[PDB]
């Protein structure tokens, strides 16, 4: 069995550079399944789609494999940076001339739904996961400030008939517990990329979420002992 990962610098091997790492690098150790980390720094649901990266996974996935999809950090606005999705949750389309093409730009849920349907057709088990939080201790006071993309991932899961993991909430829960000095130490570059220790915390919070939510992936866990509490 193989688990394919789609995401951005918070998930990717080597993170955002300069010493950081992504959470997808801290899963293999706890799964009986091979992990293929196809996350890439800087990508949004739109640009990951446009770059053919969901299609790349689709073309190698085998029946019974899993695909975990987690975007949002790069999906918001600000002229066309090649990443911003069209606003909304449905069938809205936005047109933009980007890299010499009049591009048809979809909403964040449509991109996720379309990828999910593609993987389901190939026999894969798709897990849509809400984005991780930017450092919630940046101000010295804990702030839980979900982006619109958190619930949009849940919406997408429901429309596509696939599983949802609220990775956001499990990360912010353990960050609240770990506290100000510890969590600030996980963000040496900007408030998004994580140090290796933070990437591991973030991965362990995904695994906690799987145990607590009863996600299908629990079947390939080799332990259920992860820090934090069920939410
Ligand atoms: C882009 O394509 C759409 C859909 O056909 C069309 O309305 C729009 O005018 C085109 N835009 C540009 C700037 O060519
Ligand atoms: C929070 O942690 C940062 C980094 O160690 C520290 O510089 C700041 O003073 C701490 N904030 C307070 C409110 O303790």
Residue numbers in the entry: 1 to 78, 81 to 233
Excerpt from the publication:
A virtually identical catalytic Asp-His-Ser triad was also found in rhamno­galacturonan acetylesterase (RGAE) and the esterase catalysis is assumed to follow a similar mechanism. Analysis of the structure of RGAE and comparison with structurally related enzymes led to the initial characterization of the SGNH-hydrolase family, which is now defined as a superfamily in SCOP. The structure of RGAE from Aspergillus aculeatus is known in two different crystal systems: a trigonal form and an orthorhombic form to very high (1.12 Å) resolution. An extremely low-field signal (at approximately 18 p.p.m.) in the 1H NMR spectrum of rhamnogalacturonan acetylesterase (RGAE) shows the presence of a short strong hydrogen bond in the structure.
In order to examine this hypothesis, a variant of RGAE was prepared in which the catalytic negatively charged Asp was replaced with an Asn. The crystal structure of RGAE D192N was determined to 1.33 Å resolution and refined to an R value of 11.6% for all data. The structure is virtually identical to the high-resolution (1.12 Å) structure of the wild-type enzyme except for the interactions involving the mutation and a disordered loop. The short Asp–His hydrogen bond observed in the wild type is not present and the corresponding distance between Asn192 and His195 is approximately 0.8 Å longer. As in wild-type RGAE, the imidazole group of His195 is hydrogen bonded to Ser9 (2.73 Å), whereas a hydrogen bond to a water molecule (2.79 Å) has replaced the hydrogen bond to Asp192. In RGAE D192N an acetate ion is bound in a similar position, with an O atom occupying the oxyanion hole almost in the same position as the O atom of the sulfate ion in wild-type RGAE. One loop (Gly77–Thr81) was poorly defined in the electron density of RGAE D192N. It is evident from the crystal packing that this loop cannot be in the same conformation as observed in the structure of the wild type and the disorder is most likely to be a result of differences in crystal packing and not a consequence of the D192N mutation. An analysis of the packing of RGAE D192N revealed that contacts involving Glu residues 94, 202 and 206 are similar to those of the trigonal wild-type form. Based on the structure of the D192N variant and the corresponding 1H NMR spectra we could rule out this active-site hydrogen bond as the sole origin of these signals, as the 18.2 p.p.m. signal persists in the spectra of RGAE D192N despite the mutation and the absence of the 14 p.p.m. signal in RGAE D192N.
